[PDB]
Design a protein around this ligand. Structure first.
Ligand SMILES: [Cl-]
Ligand SMILES: [Mg+2]
Ligand SMILES: [Mg+2]
Ligand SMILES: [Mg+2]
Length: 173
């Protein structure tokens, strides 16, 4: 049931540009087509002004159509941290044996969904309160692969994060 598709979950405004755009280029080059889910259908705009269109509402996501979900951070992500829909997607993908990945502030959604309890992760330095509150173990690394869970510590690690996600996906058929 491999699809060669990756889903992003991110805020429609003020998502972290580098985390999205730099990972997208790597995912595409590797043969993984990407879609964006958010809170409305239309044009999203990053913190730094970069635009992209939102393909899907969270409510329209079907896990069977994707191999992985990627939670993108940025200051706009804070609006999604306590949202039952984004947490619900984290759990949905985990329970369906998909890859669940987050970068920067996106990791907090995963922590709040209780999918990082006793799991080794990394995260944005500023967010370590939330991540530790979710019982995760914070590792001194830019990117951490823990089975099907992949985390990274923010925009400075966007390319390393994407490469790590591709590595996990390419080991699947
Ligand atoms: Cl929705
Ligand atoms: Mg407990
Ligand atoms: Mg709590
Ligand atoms: Mg502990």
């Amino acid at each position: 049931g491999k699809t060669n598709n990756i889903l992003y979950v991110m805020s429609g405004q003020n998502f972290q540009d580098e985390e999205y755009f730099e990972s997208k280029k790597i995912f595409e080059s590797a043969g993984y087509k990407t879609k964006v889910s958010s809170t409305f259908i239309g044009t999203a705009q990053g913190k730094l002004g970069g635009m992209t269109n939102i393909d899907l509402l969270f409510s329209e996501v079907d896990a069977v159509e994707f191999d992985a979900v990627v939670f993108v951070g940025g200051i706009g992500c804070i609006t999604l941290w306590d949202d039952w829909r984004t947490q619900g997607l984290a759990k949905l993908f985990l329970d369906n044996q998909k890859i669940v990945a987050g970068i920067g502030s996106g990791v907090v959604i995963m922590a709040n969904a209780k999918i990082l309890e006793e799991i080794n992760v990394t995260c944005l330095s500023a967010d370590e309160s939330h991540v530790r509150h979710g019982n995760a173990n914070i590792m001194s690394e830019n990117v951490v692969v823990s089975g099907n869970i992949v985390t990274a510590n923010g925009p400075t690690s966007s390319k390393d994060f994407a490469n790590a996600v591709v590595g996990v996906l390419n080991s699947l058929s």
